[PDB]
Design a protein around this ligand. Structure first.
Ligand SMILES: *C(=O)c1ccc(-c2ccc(C(=O)OCC)cn2)nc1
Ligand SMILES: *NNC(=O)c1ccc(-c2ccc(C(N)=O)cn2)nc1
Ligand SMILES: Cc1ccc(C)cc1
Ligand SMILES: Cc1cccc(C)c1
Ligand SMILES: Cc1cccc(C)c1
Ligand SMILES: Cc1ccccc1C
Length: 9
């Protein structure tokens, strides 16, 4: 999950 969001950065 964290990665799914952090892809933005
Ligand atoms: C959420 O974006 C998220 C959570 C966890 C993972 C993930 C990817 C790969 C592994 C892995 O290779 O585990 C080997 C023990 C674990 N967790 N991706 C995305
Ligand atoms: N928000 N994330 C990024 O902007 C981002 C772009 C690209 C990468 C990355 C990481 C690792 C590799 C590699 N070939 O091992 C390539 N590109 N990380 C973050
Ligand atoms: C965990 C996280 C991912 C993306 C942004 C833009 C901020 C925090
Ligand atoms: C969406 C996404 C983020 C990070 C890494 C992978 C393979 C996919
Ligand atoms: C998918 C991803 C982007 C930026 C930083 C991290 C740790 C993960
Ligand atoms: C599985 C994974 C997730 C996020 C960043 C790098 C890697 C190897």
């Amino acid at each position: 999950l964290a990665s799914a969001l952090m892809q933005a950065l």
